[PDB]
Amino acid sequence: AIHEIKQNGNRYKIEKVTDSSLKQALASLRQSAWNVKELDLSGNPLSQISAADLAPFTKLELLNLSSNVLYETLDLESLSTLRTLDLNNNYVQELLVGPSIETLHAANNNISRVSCSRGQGKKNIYLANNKITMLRDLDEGCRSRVQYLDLKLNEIDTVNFAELAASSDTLEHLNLQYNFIYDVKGQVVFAKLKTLDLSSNKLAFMGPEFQSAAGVTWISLRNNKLVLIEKALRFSQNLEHFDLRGNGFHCGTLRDFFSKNQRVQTVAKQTVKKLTGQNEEECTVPTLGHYGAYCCEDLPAPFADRLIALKRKEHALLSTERLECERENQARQREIDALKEQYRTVIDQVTLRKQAKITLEQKKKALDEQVSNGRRAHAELDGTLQQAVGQIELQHATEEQSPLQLLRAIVKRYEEMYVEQQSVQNNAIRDWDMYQHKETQLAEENARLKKLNGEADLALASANATLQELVVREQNLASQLG
Amino acid sequence: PRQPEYKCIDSQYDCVFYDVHIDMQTQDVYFGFEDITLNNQKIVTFKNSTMRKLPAALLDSFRQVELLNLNDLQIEEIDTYAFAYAHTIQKLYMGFNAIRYLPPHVFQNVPLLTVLVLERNDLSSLPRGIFHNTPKLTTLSMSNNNLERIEDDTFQATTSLQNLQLSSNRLTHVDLSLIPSLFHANVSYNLLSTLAIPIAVEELDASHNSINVVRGPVNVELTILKLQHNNLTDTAWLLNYPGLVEVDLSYNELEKIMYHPFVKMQRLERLYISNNRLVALNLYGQPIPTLKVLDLSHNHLLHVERNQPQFDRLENLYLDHNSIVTLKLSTHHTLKNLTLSHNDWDCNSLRALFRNVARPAVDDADQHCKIDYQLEHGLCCKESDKPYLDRLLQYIALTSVVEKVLEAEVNELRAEVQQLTNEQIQQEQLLQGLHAEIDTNLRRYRLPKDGLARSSDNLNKVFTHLKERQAFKLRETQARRTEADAKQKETEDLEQENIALEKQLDNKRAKQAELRQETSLKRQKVKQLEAKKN
Numbered sequence A: 001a002i003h004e005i006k007q008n009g010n011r012y013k014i015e016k017v018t019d020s021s022l023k024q025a026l027a028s029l030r031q032s033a034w035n036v037k038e039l040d041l042s043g044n045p046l047s048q049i050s051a052a053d054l055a056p057f058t059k060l061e062l063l064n065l066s067s068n069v070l071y072e073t074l075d076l077e078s079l080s081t082l083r084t085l086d087l088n089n090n091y092v093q094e095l096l097v098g099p100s101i102e103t104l105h106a107a108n109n110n111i112s113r114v115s116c117s118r119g120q121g122k123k124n125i126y127l128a129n130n131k132i133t134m135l136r137d138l139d140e141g142c143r144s145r146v147q148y149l150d151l152k153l154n155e156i157d158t159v160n161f162a163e164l165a166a167s168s169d170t171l172e173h174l175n176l177q178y179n180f181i182y183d184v185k186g187q188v189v190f191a192k193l194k195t196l197d198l199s200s201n202k203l204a205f206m207g208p209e210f211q212s213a214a215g216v217t218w219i220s221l222r223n224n225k226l227v228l229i230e231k232a233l234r235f236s237q238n239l240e241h242f243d244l245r246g247n248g249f250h251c252g253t254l255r256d257f258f259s260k261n262q263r264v265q266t267v268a269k270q271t272v273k274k275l276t277g278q279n280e281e282e283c284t285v286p287t288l289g290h291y292g293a294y295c296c297e298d299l300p301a302p303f304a305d306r307l308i309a310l311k312r313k314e315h316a317l318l319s320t321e322r323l324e325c326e327r328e329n330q331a332r333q334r335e336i337d338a339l340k341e342q343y344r345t346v347i348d349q350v351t352l353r354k355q356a357k358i359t360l361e362q363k364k365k366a367l368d369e370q371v372s373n374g375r376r377a378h379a380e381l382d383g384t385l386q387q388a389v390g391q392i393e394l395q396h397a398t399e400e401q402s403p404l405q406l407l408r409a410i411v412k413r414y415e416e417m418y419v420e421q422q423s424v425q426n427n428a429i430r431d432w433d434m435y436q437h438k439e440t441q442l443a444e445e446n447a448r449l450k451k452l453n454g455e456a457d458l459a460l461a462s463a464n465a466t467l468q469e470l471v472v473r474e475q476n477l478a479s480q481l482g
Numbered sequence B: 001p002r003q004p005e006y007k008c009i010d011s012q013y014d015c016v017f018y019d020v021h022i023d024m025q026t027q028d029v030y031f032g033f034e035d036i037t038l039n040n041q042k043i044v045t046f047k048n049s050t051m052r053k054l055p056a057a058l059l060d061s062f063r064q065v066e067l068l069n070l071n072d073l074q075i076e077e078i079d080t081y082a083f084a085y086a087h088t089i090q091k092l093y094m095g096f097n098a099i100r101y102l103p104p105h106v107f108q109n110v111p112l113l114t115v116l117v118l119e120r121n122d123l124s125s126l127p128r129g130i131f132h133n134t135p136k137l138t139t140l141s142m143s144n145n146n147l148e149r150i151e152d153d154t155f156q157a158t159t160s161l162q163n164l165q166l167s168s169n170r171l172t173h174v175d176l177s178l179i180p181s182l183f184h185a186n187v188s189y190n191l192l193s194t195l196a197i198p199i200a201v202e203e204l205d206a207s208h209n210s211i212n213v214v215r216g217p218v219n220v221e222l223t224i225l226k227l228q229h230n231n232l233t234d235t236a237w238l239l240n241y242p243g244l245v246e247v248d249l250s251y252n253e254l255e256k257i258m259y260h261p262f263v264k265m266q267r268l269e270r271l272y273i274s275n276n277r278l279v280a281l282n283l284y285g286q287p288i289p290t291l292k293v294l295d296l297s298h299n300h301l302l303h304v305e306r307n308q309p310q311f312d313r314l315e316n317l318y319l320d321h322n323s324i325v326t327l328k329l330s331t332h333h334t335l336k337n338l339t340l341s342h343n344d345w346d347c348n349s350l351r352a353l354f355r356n357v358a359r360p361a362v363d364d365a366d367q368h369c370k371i372d373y374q375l376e377h378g379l380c381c382k383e384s385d386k387p388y389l390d391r392l393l394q395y396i397a398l399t400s401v402v403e404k405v406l407e408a409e410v411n412e413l414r415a416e417v418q419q420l421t422n423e424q425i426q427q428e429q430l431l432q433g434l435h436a437e438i439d440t441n442l443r444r445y446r447l448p449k450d451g452l453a454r455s456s457d458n459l460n461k462v463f464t465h466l467k468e469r470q471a472f473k474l475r476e477t478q479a480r481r482t483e484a485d486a487k488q489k490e491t492e493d494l495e496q497e498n499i500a501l502e503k504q505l506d507n508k509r510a511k512q513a514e515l516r517q518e519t520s521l522k523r524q525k526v527k528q529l530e531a532k533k534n
């Protein structure tokens, strides 16, 4: 027993406990189970948690697993009384909680699935800095009666508001900033939505689907890649903050949208002024003109030109934006670090090392997997190159050849062979032309001889008829004469 | 003695040597009469003959030949002096033999040479000075040899050379710009990578090379330029050829076309650009007013609609095999031929288009459509309010699938992890230059790259492509050869059937003589019967 169980009323805290000692630790509270209302395990080197070991505490209402080194699945579905679960700062990958969860703190994990058994209360879900890739990564229950949903710094591509319909009446805060979102879609009336944050994503079109957030007070599409705004959008008088800086708008749509949301234009101005200090955004190029408060431009066809530029990289004969890109990736890593800070807990030096031992065992293990995938890819290439040199004839190599050198020799040889083959074919086609000309010469001579024959055939017939007229005169005379 | 002696036989040619056969052992031969001066036939050829070596004896005894036709006589060697007495030869035909080399001064004495065909031999090089003495040379063919270079002095004295055929050798250098008299030339199917174009040539075919650079003086006469099947990557050079009527840039490596290199073309009618890598086209800034046929098919065109002012003016417009989303034609357009199949059409754009052009002007059609597309007017199209946004999203969704892809124990582990991190970096570096090259070869052969597939699969994509390509080329050649053999067969049968028609002509003359004898013999009998009747 190097571990300590502090009690304060009906809140218990366990310290200096480890994976091999935690089950003991919990058993020594079974006597007192009725009274364990909050249990706090934070700041230890725990890496697994036995839902079943905790099921005796049937009054357990808050469980704080924050800043341990939990990995893989964390399954607490079975804790049906559980209401607040804090597992900020771990490495969990899938997470399942039970029918009573009201607040779920899970920032700074490796989370990419979450299940929430069916239930009647609202839920506040906090998932900043994980690996969610799409809303359906949260199960149906996880998306019912959500009131606050923080998915900042995840890995989502596309939002489909329909998938949050079971929170039409509850959802008040939706944070999706710093993902990778390039399409949003779905019509749903979010009766309660106060704020929507799509800052730093990759959206190109604010479309009809944003009537879903017509009620908000606060909305950001800051730092996306917007060009067009759907004009049919009708925002409430409720709106106060409306940030669109860092896009690339075609003035056409600024004018068309302000025209029937006149209000929003002064709201736009007031937002940039609150945020930056002047009443218009600082366009990337001064030459560039605003409409109201946002930089804009009469653009021939912005979507087509973006698609053409992609298709050029795809199809270019050879294998700027590496500055737009690299500073976009630093922007992200500054937010992650910042956030890793905003959620940092206090931890003693001896448990840091206890923690770094388990964490380093996982890095080493992942690196072994990677170094060995590497080794496999390498032998596969060597194998393929050895099948290849067995099917053609390479020049003699004096020095040992690398795989780069082998691929160059192999393509080179096929190119020689192709050219040889083509040269052979040319000769054959030229031969056919020479013999065909010869055929026409011969077939001319064929008609010349056929016509001469036709004409001898005639001349024999003449000379015959003439021999016959003489034959008649001979037999007429001989009659007359003897 | 004069043991083996061959004599003429007037027929086109005024001298036709028959059944002559010389080989490599043959020592002494005699042509015509001994009195060289009776041999003054000017237009000589051979029939049923094969001369492994062309004997000095021939133009030793015949010094009055104008046109010498030695086509297809299995000649393998030319006697070092066969042409010493050939002062009068104007036209020399030696195609389709097996000549491996020309002796250095073999044409030092045929100074009235105007036409020379050496096509389809085994020449590997020309001797320095080979033509320094045939200033009158106007037509020269050496198509189908194994030549690697035509040195620059080769044609310094042939300042009338108008028609040059070098097609289908192994040429890596030949500077046509040094022969300013050229009127027609064909250096197709060689290994060229730069093409110098002389000042006044009017038709030039340099297709099937690897040309990436064109140079030479502005040339206003150049009318037909064939460059299909090359390594071209820009077109600015075109500015220098204001007189083109047709140019073929097919099967090159072009990525865009702009109007700038065409602004000086006063009469261009025909511009072929199929099978490049076009991702953009702007010919509307300044249209080419005279153009009639424009082939852009099999590229990667996406947005072409602003080219309306050029397209309206064409007769023949081939957009097939691209990703074109919209196209727009005036009611007054002049197209008679239009291809549209295999793109990525917007249904609204197709419907408005088919108000102004209909089949049979539209010459092609789709068969089956992907999941969200359906036929309008015979071509696949998807309904969409914003087609370009849609195509931009479609594309991004395909690529993002790929973009989603004792504390002594603690000190020993930090070490272990650093040593592994280094092995893993080294593994990437070591195979780097290789992955670069695999991508270069997929781009080169226009293979599509599966950013999922494991590396040995991309490497196999290249090899499978090359092997298929070899096989298909080989089968194709076999077919061509089967065709040549068959056609030689036909000519052998034809000549047999001509011999039989000639034997028949021979019999009929004999019958005519007989009948003519029988006629006089009766004319006689009837004269006798008349005297005996006083």
Ligand SMILES: *[C@@H]1O[C@H](CO)[C@@H](O[C@@H]2O[C@H](CO)[C@@H](O[C@@H]3O[C@H](CO[C@H]4O[C@H](CO)[C@@H](O)[C@H](O[C@H]5O[C@H](CO)[C@@H](O)[C@H](O)[C@@H]5O)[C@@H]4O)[C@@H](O)[C@H](O[C@H]4O[C@H](CO)[C@@H](O)[C@H](O)[C@@H]4O)[C@@H]3O)[C@H](O)[C@H]2NC(C)=O)[C@H](O)[C@H]1NC(C)=O
Pocket: A426, A429, A430, A432, B167, B168, B186, B187, B188, B189, B204, B205, B226, B483, B484
């Ligand atoms: C520079 O130098 C090169 C010499 O290397 C010249 O290149 C030659 O150019 C001509 C094109 O002008 C090529 O000939 C053409 O060949 C095509 C292809 O036909 C092939 O495939 C056909 C399609 O399936 C098939 O029909 C063919 O079969 C035919 O011919 C074979 C002969 O064996 C025979 O078996 C059949 O009876 C067929 O008839 C063949 O496999 C051909 O389609 C062209 O057809 C002729 O008839 C059409 C009818 O509409 C007519 O419009 C054409 O004008 C033509 O006369 C044509 O023959 C040729 O193959 C190339 N030769 C070589 C050696 O590569 C080049 O032209 C020179 N340049 C310049 C500028 O002069």
Ligand SMILES: *[C@@H]1O[C@H](CO)[C@@H](O[C@@H]2O[C@H](CO)[C@@H](O)[C@H](O)[C@H]2NC(C)=O)[C@H](O)[C@H]1NC(C)=O
Pocket: A040, A042, A043, A064, A065, A066, A067, A084, A085, A086, A105, A344, A345, A346
């Ligand atoms: C779980 O325990 C942690 C501490 O391990 C609590 O984190 C505190 O969080 C506040 C901000 O909420 C910070 O000011 C404190 O500094 C943190 N404490 C320490 C020691 O770092 C956390 O709030 C607990 N979670 C719940 C839900 O009660």
Ligand SMILES: *[C@@H]1O[C@H](CO)[C@@H](O[C@@H]2O[C@H](CO)[C@@H](O)[C@H](O)[C@H]2NC(C)=O)[C@H](O)[C@H]1NC(C)=O
Pocket: A071, A091, A093, A110, A362, A365, A366, A369
């Ligand atoms: C976070 O999650 C990913 C994937 O869920 C982890 O990588 C997987 O882990 C196992 C064990 O190393 C492997 O069999 C798979 O190859 C992995 N999948 C992928 C896509 O890599 C990863 O190790 C986790 N990160 C941390 C630090 O815990």
Ligand SMILES: *[C@@H]1O[C@H](CO)[C@@H](O[C@@H]2O[C@H](CO)[C@@H](O)[C@H](O)[C@H]2NC(C)=O)[C@H](O)[C@H]1NC(C)=O
Pocket: A460, A461, A464, A465, A468
């Ligand atoms: C030359 O002319 C005569 C007359 O046509 C040929 O003799 C025959 O003519 C009679 C009368 O019509 C026929 O009965 C015979 O068929 C003919 N043939 C024979 C065999 O007598 C005569 O044969 C002619 N000679 C030739 C071969 O042209």
Ligand SMILES: *[C@@H]1O[C@H](CO)[C@@H](O[C@@H]2O[C@H](CO)[C@@H](O)[C@H](O)[C@H]2NC(C)=O)[C@H](O)[C@H]1NC(C)=O
Pocket: B210, B212, B231
């Ligand atoms: C097509 O043209 C390009 C440009 O000349 C060739 O690429 C050059 O050739 C080699 C390496 O590929 C070197 O001489 C140069 O460094 C290359 N230049 C560039 C810009 O890549 C290319 O080889 C030609 N393609 C073919 C098939 O010949």
Ligand SMILES: *[C@@H]1O[C@H](CO)[C@@H](O)[C@H](O)[C@H]1NC(C)=O
Pocket: B019, B048
């Ligand atoms: C050519 O000469 C040889 C030998 O006499 C002969 O057998 C061959 O068929 C000849 N060709 C003709 C058509 O005379």
Ligand SMILES: *[C@H]1O[C@H](CO)[C@@H](O)[C@H](O)[C@H]1NC(C)=O
Pocket: B336, B337, B338, B360, B361, B363
């Ligand atoms: C032009 O198109 C094709 C060949 O390019 C030809 O078959 C067609 O019949 C021609 N056009 C018309 C109006 O028929």
